Amino acid sequence: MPVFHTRTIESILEPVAQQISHLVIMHEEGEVDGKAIPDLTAPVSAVQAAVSNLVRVGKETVQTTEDQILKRDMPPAFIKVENACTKLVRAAQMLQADPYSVPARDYLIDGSRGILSGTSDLLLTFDEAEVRKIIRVCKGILEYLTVAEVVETMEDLVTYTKNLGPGMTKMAKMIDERQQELTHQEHRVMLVNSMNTVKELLPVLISAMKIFVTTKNTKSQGIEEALKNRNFTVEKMSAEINEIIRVLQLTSW
């Protein structure tokens, strides 16, 4: 179609995409021109039924969703699959009158391609919505990292750790599950490495905050280092989370 974005989308569309790619070449080479195509009334009727149910359930979502971007990006896919379906239905009609109909064959290839393209669009639009759910979790952590600098007491720090810790565990789970699904290895590597770095820095962040909190009135030398270490760690963690957010939205070709 060519390459699909996730292993789930791949598992759904890859077989029919390959079958259509072969059909396209067959048609380009005139391989189906010579023989009568049998009545496709039944198989086309099944496609029509599947299209109606797809669009029905898709339309339900468009008015049963809070998601504003999902609202606008989904409808064009219904129109595409609808168009494709009219060609398939028309081809079946033509073939009933004349199994050697050339226009019918053009409708078969273009309709099959249209079904694939529209369904691909639909699944990506849902996928994009799922990625937005992951990014909102990442942005939550980004925001909570900005208020590390306001922590001044041990009870502030304990509260901060108890809030940030689980948030990080949730993000880690989402990124780990997401990377496993990606079809592009380069992107998996970036997500894994970034998440690994974020996990490494968490205890480094808390260590520096603890020194500051426990020694702020001493005034050591360790205080200045604790402030610098905290600031630098927050900066580096934030950069890695922003990289995760970037990679989640790529892309390829």
């Binding site: 759904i12 099944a46 599947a50 149910n53 694939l116």
Partner: peptide, 22 residues
């Protein structure tokens, strides 16, 4: 997930394409 409806449409399309080639 609209995976149920997508899989059904993909399989129905596969059946169609197979019938054309047969």
């Amino acid at each position: 997930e609209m995976v149920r409806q997508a899989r059904i449409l993909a399989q129905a399309t596969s059946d169609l394409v197979n019938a054309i080639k047969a």
